[PDB]
Design a protein around this ligand. Structure first.
Ligand SMILES: CC[C@@H]1[C@H](F)C(=O)N[C@@H]1COc1nccc2cc(C(N)=O)c(OC)cc12
Length: 289
C-alpha cells in the first residue's frame, strides 16, 4: 500500500472538512473509530478515513486496529471486500485511504440518506449475495470479521457489495476479555466474549432483516427498539414478514422475500451450532434468485 503524507491527505480533503458533502464539506460518514472524507489523489477520487477515539478507546488500541486493518488488507483481496490503496502515520492523526465507493454504505442506501432513490428488490438480492461471498472469502481464509453490519457493507459504481472495516478482524472456540462489536448485531455468545465465525453469521442475519424491511437494527423511538426482536414477533404468529417488508420497492415477490427471511431466521438461531455455515448461506441466497 502507498504511504501518504498526512499533509497531502489534509490538502485533498479541504483540511478534513467535517461538514457533510450535502452542505459543501467532505464528510461522507463517521463511526466510533473515525470519520470518512472524500479526497482527490492523482486524478482519482478516494476515501480517506481519519482515525479518532469517537467511542472511548485508547490511542494504543486505535493504533492496534489501524495495524490490524492494513495486515488483513495485505492478506485478503476479493471482489466483495473494499480495496485499501494506502495509509498515513507521519502526521497529527492516523489515516486509511480507500478506493472511492460512490454509493456509500448499505446502511445509508437503505435509509435513502441525502435523497438517494430506494434500492430495488433486484439490487437488494445482488447485495445480499455479494456480502455473503465476501464473508465466505474471509471464513475460507480463517478470518472472523467481528463487526458485520450494514454500515460495514459498501457499495461501488455497480452497487457491488464490499465488506469494510477490518480493524477488529481476528485470525482463527476462543474467549476474549475485550468484548467488541455493535450490540444491535451481536450474537449472544459474542456478547459473552466468545470469538467464533458463527457470530458473523448471526450479525449477517440482522443485515438480511435490514435489507428486507429497510429498518435500522436499532431505533430508540421505534417499538420494538431492536430489529432482531421482529423474528420473535413473526415466530410467535403476532405478525408476518409481509407486515415488515420495505414498502419502498415495487419489484419484490413473496417467494424470494420469504426465501431471504428463511435464510435470516436460520442465521439468527440463538444456539451457535444450529446456524448454517457461510457456504450454506451462499447456496440458499443463490437458490433464492
Ligand atoms: C467511519 C465510518 C465507518 C467505516 F469507515 C466503515 O467502513 N463503515 C462506516 C461508514 O463508512 C462509510 N460510510 C459512508 C461512505 C463510505 C465510503 C467509503 C469509501 N471507500 O468510499 C468508506 O470507505 C471505508 C466508508 C464509508
Amino acid at each position: 500500500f502507498h504511504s501518504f503524507s498526512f499533509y497531502e491527505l489534509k490538502n485533498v480533503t479541504n483540511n478534513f472538512d467535517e461538514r457533510p458533502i450535502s452542505v459543501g464539506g467532505n464528510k461522507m460518514g463517521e463511526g466510533g473509530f473515525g470519520v470518512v472524507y472524500k479526497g482527490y489523489v492523482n486524478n482519482t477520487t478516494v476515501a480517506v478515513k481519519k482515525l479518532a477515539a469517537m467511542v472511548d478507546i485508547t490511542t494504543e488500541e486505535l493504533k492496534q486496529q489501524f495495524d490490524q486493518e492494513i495486515k488483513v488488507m495485505a492478506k485478503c483481496q476479493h471482489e466483495n471486500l473494499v480495496e485499501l490503496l494506502g495509509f498515513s502515520s507521519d502526521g497529527d492523526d492516523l489515516c486509511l485511504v480507500y478506493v472511492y465507493m460512490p454509493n456509500g454504505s448499505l446502511l445509508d442506501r437503505l435509509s435513502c440518506l441525502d435523497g438517494t432513490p430506494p434500492l430495488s428488490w433486484h439490487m437488494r438480492c445482488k447485495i445480499a449475495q455479494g456480502a455473503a461471498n465476501g464473508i465466505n472469502f474471509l471464513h475460507e481464509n480463517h478470518h472472523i470479521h467481528r463487526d458485520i453490519k450494514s454500515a460495514n457493507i459498501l457499495l461501488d459504481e455497480a452497487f457491488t457489495a464490499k465488506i469494510s472495516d477490518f480493524g477488529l478482524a481476528r485470525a482463527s472456540t476462543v474467549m476474549t476479555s475485550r468484548i467488541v462489536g455493535t450490540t444491535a448485531y451481536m450474537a449472544p455468545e459474542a456478547l459473552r466474549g466468545e470469538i467464533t465465525p458463527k457470530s458473523d453469521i448471526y450479525s449477517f442475519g440482522v443485515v438480511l432483516l435490514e435489507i428486507i424491511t429497510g429498518l435500522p437494527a436499532v431505533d430508540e423511538h421505534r417499538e420494538p427498539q431492536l430489529l432482531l426482536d421482529i423474528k420473535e414477533e413473526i415466530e410467535d404468529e403476532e405478525k408476518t414478514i409481509e407486515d415488515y417488508i420495505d414498502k419502498k420497492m415495487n419489484d419484490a415477490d413473496s417467494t424470494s422475500v420469504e426465501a431471504m427471511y428463511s435464510v435470516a431466521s436460520q442465521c439468527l438461531h440463538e444456539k451457535k451450532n444450529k446456524r448454517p455455515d457461510i457456504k450454506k448461506v451462499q447456496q440458499l441466497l443463490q437458490e433464492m434468485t
